[PDB]
Design a protein around this nucleic acid. Structure first.
Length: 97
DNA sequence: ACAGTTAAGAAT
DNA sequence: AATTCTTAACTGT
């Protein structure tokens, strides 16, 4: 299961479970794939990534998480912790799901 | 329910 | 390829 992260003249190819989560970049129409120890900026939209696979869940407007790489959830604070020790946030309306 | 912020379409 | 404007739909309380 591999995904092509398109970057204009380049592409980077990554396995689904290399990915902790995706977040929107502050560069318009770019996302950031968070991997174990690297981050890769690419062209995409979050909606499309969440439809690739059941493991990819839109927990927030700005985040798509890989369920397989979740270490724990603090549902009080709405913080999703990943196996590489990063974290991101779940929205009030999506945290339960 | 609100006001502030943002993802993503379209065009090029 | 990379960028802008736009706006509905998101955000947290």
């Amino acid at each position: 299961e591999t995904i092509e992260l398109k970057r204009g003249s380049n592409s980077v190819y990554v396995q689904y479970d290399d990915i902790m989560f995706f977040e929107s970049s502050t560069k318009s129409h770019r996302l950031i794939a968070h991997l174990d120890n690297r981050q890769i900026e690419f062209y995409g939209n979050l909606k499309e990534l969440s439809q690739l696979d059941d493991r990819f869940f839109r927990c927030h407007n700005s985040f798509v998480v890989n369920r397989h790489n979740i270490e724990s959830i603090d549902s009080k604070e709405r913080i999703v912790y990943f196996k590489n020790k990063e974290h991101c946030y779940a929205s009030v309306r999506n945290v339960k799901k």
